[PDB]
Amino acid sequence: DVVVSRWLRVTVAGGVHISGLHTESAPRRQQEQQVPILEKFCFTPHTEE
Amino acid sequence: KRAYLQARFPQLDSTSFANSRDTSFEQHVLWHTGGKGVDLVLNSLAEE
Numbered sequence: 731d732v733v734v735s736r737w738l739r740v741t742v743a744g745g746v747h748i749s750g751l752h753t754e755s756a757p758r759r760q761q762e763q764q765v766p767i768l769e770k771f772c773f774t775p776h777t778e779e
Numbered sequence: 780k781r782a783y784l785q786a787r788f789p790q791l792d793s794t795s796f797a798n799s800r801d802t803s804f805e806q807h808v809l810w811h812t813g814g815k816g817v818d819l820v821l822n823s824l825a826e827e
Contacts, residue, residue, distance in 0.1 A: 737814035738806050 802827060 732743030741748040781796050794811050797804035808817060 738809050740806075 799824070 732741070734741045739750055741751065784796070785791055797807045
């Protein structure tokens with residue numbers, strides 16, 4: 731069982747006891763991100779001029 | 780000492796005292812202040 735106390739900045743579970751954990755934002759920038767194919771569903775007459 | 784201080788200063792409540800011989804006072808202060816902490820800290824202890 732785990733308990734997190736943001737007020738005391740302590741996380742306790744089992745036989746472990748973490749205090750004063752500090753986390754810093756990562757850039758979160760990943761290369762080669764997915765590139766979706768964008769299209770429009772449009773009517774099209776068979777014959778045009 | 781706690782009893783003597785309580786006698787000297789009636790304003791002090793049972794929640795305004797901690798233990799000076801260990802680092803347990805930190806949790807007490809943080810809890811009773813809602814995690815905000817204190818403003819002035821007249822520190823006289825040492826090391827940890």
